[PDB]
Paper text:
The Streptococcus pyogenes bacterium secretes the protease IdeS and the glycosidase EndoS, which specifically catalyse cleavage and deglycosylation of human IgG, respectively. We present crystal structures of both enzymes in complex with their IgG1 Fc substrate, which was achieved using Fc engineering to disfavour preferential Fc crystallisation. We show that mutation of IgG Fc residue E382, which consistently forms salt bridge interactions in Fc crystal structures, can be used as a strategy to discourage Fc self-crystallisation and thus promote crystallisation of protein complexes. We present crystal structures of IdeS/IgG1 and EndoS/IgG1 complexes, to a resolution of 2.34 Å and 3.45 Å, respectively, and map the extensive interfaces that are formed in these complexes.
Author numbering:
A (entry chain C): 102 to 542, 548 to 823
B (entry chain A), C (entry chain B): 238 to 444
Write the structure that this text describes.
Amino acid sequence: EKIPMKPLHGPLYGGYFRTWHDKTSDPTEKDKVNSMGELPKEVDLAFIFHDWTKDYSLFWKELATKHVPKLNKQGTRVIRTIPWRFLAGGDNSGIAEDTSKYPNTPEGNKALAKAIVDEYVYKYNLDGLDVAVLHDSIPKVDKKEDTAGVERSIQVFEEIGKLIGPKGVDKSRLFIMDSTYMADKNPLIERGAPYINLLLVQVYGSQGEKGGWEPVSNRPEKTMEERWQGYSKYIRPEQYMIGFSFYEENAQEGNLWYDINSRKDEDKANGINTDITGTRAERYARWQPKTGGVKGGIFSYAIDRDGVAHQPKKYAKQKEFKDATDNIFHSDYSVSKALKTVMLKDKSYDLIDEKDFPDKALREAVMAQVGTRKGDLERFNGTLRLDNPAIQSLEGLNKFKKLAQLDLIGLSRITKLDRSVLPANMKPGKDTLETVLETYKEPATIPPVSLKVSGLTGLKELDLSGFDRETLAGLDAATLTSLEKVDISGNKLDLAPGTENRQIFDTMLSTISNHVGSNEQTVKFDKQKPTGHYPDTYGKTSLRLPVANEKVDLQSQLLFGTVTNQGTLINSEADYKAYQNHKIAGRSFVDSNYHYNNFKVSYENYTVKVTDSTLGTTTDKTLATDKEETYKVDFFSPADKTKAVHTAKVIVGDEKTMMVNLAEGATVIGGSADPVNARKVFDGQLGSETDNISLGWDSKQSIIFKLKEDGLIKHWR
Amino acid sequence: PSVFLFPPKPKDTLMISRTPEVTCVVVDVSHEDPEVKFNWYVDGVEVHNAKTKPREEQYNSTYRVVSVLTVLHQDWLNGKEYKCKVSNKALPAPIEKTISKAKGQPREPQVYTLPPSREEMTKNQVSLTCLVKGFYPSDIAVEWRSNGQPENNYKTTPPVLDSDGSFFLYSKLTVDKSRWQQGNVFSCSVMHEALHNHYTQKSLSLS
Amino acid sequence: PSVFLFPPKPKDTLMISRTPEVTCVVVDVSHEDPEVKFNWYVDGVEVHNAKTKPREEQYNSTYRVVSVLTVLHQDWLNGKEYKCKVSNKALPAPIEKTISKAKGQPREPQVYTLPPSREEMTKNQVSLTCLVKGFYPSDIAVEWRSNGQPENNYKTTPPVLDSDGSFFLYSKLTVDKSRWQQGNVFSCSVMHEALHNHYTQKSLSLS
Ligand SMILES: *[C@@H]1O[C@H](CO[C@@H]2O[C@@H](C)[C@@H](O)[C@@H](O)[C@@H]2O)[C@@H](O[C@@H]2O[C@H](CO)[C@@H](O[C@@H]3O[C@H](CO[C@H]4O[C@H](CO)[C@@H](O)[C@H](O)[C@@H]4O[C@@H]4O[C@H](CO)[C@@H](O)[C@H](O)[C@H]4NC(C)=O)[C@@H](O)[C@H](O[C@H]4O[C@H](CO)[C@@H](O)[C@H](O)[C@@H]4O[C@@H]4O[C@H](CO)[C@@H](O)[C@H](O)[C@H]4NC(C)=O)[C@@H]3O)[C@H](O)[C@H]2NC(C)=O)[C@H](O)[C@H]1NC(C)=O
């Protein structure tokens, strides 16, 4: 019966064995000399990819009796691969064809879930189920995509997950899903994320490795990284598994990936290439995500074609070509075993030990939240909660290279805090990891870790020097009772009166004076370099000038301001010189090097639109004031040209009331011009670069129209 | 890499409310170097108002980079040479393709509506015909409409080359016999560059 | 080298007196090695009764080796797969092309003759129409004849796909108004596999 087997551990290697290449699949076909029992111990998962093989083939007897126990003995699980449409569909849906037996109801899908599992998993005493969510296997009705069928499969997938998998009664059997779709595109990932053990993305060829191309962007899309990136939200990284493909015999265009090494045109006789060097599979074996954690492993397709060389690219055009590779060979599964050992050689799959985290409560908290690998520390970019109070030493937090957030909650026993016992990304930095995939022809920026320190009663020292911290948010100073030393020098902190940082600093400083006084040795907070941002809104919304023969720079006059991350508006250089002289303990915090010019944000590249009283637009900062006029000056960011950041009201001389276009919204009621394009001369906008506002065909065209409102017309344009 | 420049729809070029497009498809694009830079000219006047269409969901095999260009009606009808210069890194030098309107003396389409056959009156449905002959060039569009409301169930034959040199075509409007016998109006709406406002109608009803 | 297998003329396959041909053109043939060996199969049954056509005038540049095969009518109408296996020395392995009759339930062509339009009666010439609809497959042939004598000046539109799934087409016979008003007979002679003797006529005259 169900043989006991050790759980899934380390890097895995999958392999879809094609049934019709088995020797017992069809005795008439004598060329098939392979067997599914010959799969070695290196192969963790052995998927049963069934087609062509007959319904009542001799393979099914050989599978359940001879193969499954042999594989389970050595340590290899057997999994059945059903398509998407077996869960819900009509066209070739196997079990779901009989809709009268298994209806589309709450109870009906629960009966179908059992029927699927029993027929596929438990029938031959297999060790898991696999669902292939592809466009090739998508639920169709009369060779047309079915909307209700896809919505049914989702619900069925949940019910099957209640039977087998992690959240099932029978957890011995695996529940797997394989997908060419991406996370955002595939709809089952959201619903059946907890219900699966492994996800098997199929990314054959350079289209998978390098990613497709976006012509409008002229940049790569759906890359290997971007593929995972979406799935990272839904599943853990150790569940993820990538797929390559071996050469299928007499393969045609649209199914030639050239993953494993091709045949040499010289070597006409030889059609075997067990060498794995310079292959896509070998690179896939070595590939690890840049964030989140290490992958679960890789898998092959048509593992029965292990070691078989790929048909050259030259002969890819000619359909009827009998190459040496198109012959069938008795594979000894050298590549599978080689690629497995390559993944074992990977050092990231080394477990976390006392070397990394001496403290047990920390080491257990990390294992629960983050992961159980050394590589996970280099990658993981999520929250890490250290709420457990019984924690002595935070040694080896520097192992975390890309941690997103760190919560220190109720950790009284902690005393000192410095770069040693904190993440590496306390300060900013670029990506240190290196990819092992091919590409076309810049390392990613690592966000500084968010630090919430609250409830640490027995915390004494606190060093955050040279970390370039933007704020002091998170530091609950009221709970830090036993505080004595502090160091926040060489950061980008706005420590001005009234700021949240100063409130935290003052609450901290009052604790320092009590215990060991306040001085240069205990307290440090010098040489700050606060980040200068753009303000949300602006105050200077008007400007009355004379009718002088002079020119004025509207930008400098109207558009100015450099807010901080806390919220201190520095408008002029004088305001900064005042800011520089925020003396705390008889010395300023701001660096002397960090002048106003280094802090100031540039308002170059900002566009401007000067609408005069007769709605006459002009895009020039240098406004002449020689003529009497009233203006509405709108400013726009280099990013967003449509939405104005600020609007002003310049009035050279006596104010004139701003006119309004009475034609805008005019009811066209005649003229030779086309009524459609006639309305678009009163639309309000000019039009898109590639619009069409041709009034008519003839050179002369007329428009008869009525105004929207009554008024006194003083001007037209 | 192969280039395939295509002309605008006749209906689009003969109606100013609609927007005509000169599509430039590129098939068998290099998988290694998939960068494609399109350059668009109109009698030498290079325009930069094109729009590369998003990569459609072809399964595998060959990249197919489309590039559309919105064009002025007058420019097409005047017969300006729209040139699509494709530029690929794999390609040693750019592939150019040029297209223009059919060059020849335009001719007015004589539009004629024919009623259902005397034999077809026995059937529960009937076929209203619209002959359109003696026109040039082949760029033409035809539409039916019953009592103002645009018709659904009709089909138009391709422009066929006539003996004299002009083209011709028919358009079959399949309707129920009820609406014919009751006495509705059905109007064949031909559209050709050699018409008043590129438009003309011929009504058809029972007698 | 590119191969282009072509079906027989509809008129040839629907008349036993005429002889149908399955042409297999080969273009862009190697200038270096111009030897082309055609192999002809009919559901595997290799036939050896083909005839390589002489090199037509041609305007240099690229060799175009045509190969004709005379076929039995019944074999075509039954829908046997005619396969043209081209073999060139430059070509690494032979290019095969296969063709057969359209697979689906045949349907009878409803033939209807329509007289000239009421408006066209003002013109010195008139257009006699012949609607042919509701037929499948597209393999069809149409001819006019006035008082027995085969007509010269007429044109037939390609088979156009109808809404239901069948095809249809029109045929325009341009004649003088004199012969129409005088009261001659003109007969639209449709020919389709789903007819009696693959043949049917509909006469047309003044009333
Ligand atoms: C585009 O590429 C993708 C793959 O790439 C992926 O997507 C792209 C976009 C990128 O993102 C990549 O990075 C990414 O990796 C293609 O998807 C693959 O397509 C190939 C075929 O081109 C498939 O291989 C074939 O698989 C069929 C199996 O078909 C079953 O399984 C399908 C998947 O579940 C399912 O959709 C089918 O409906 C079918 O399902 C079965 O249905 C029956 C009946 O209901 C049921 O009983 C079964 O239980 C059920 N089984 C399953 C598992 O669902 C297989 O049959 C094919 O074998 C033929 O072709 C081989 C060569 O490719 C050849 O070696 C074999 O010998 C065999 O050839 C036939 O042999 C018989 C004799 O036995 C002979 O009589 C025939 O004449 C002969 N036929 C031919 C044509 O030679 C083959 O193995 C992949 O499985 C599939 N990928 C995956 C992961 O499944 C996509 O199709 C490509 N599209 C285009 C347009 O190019």
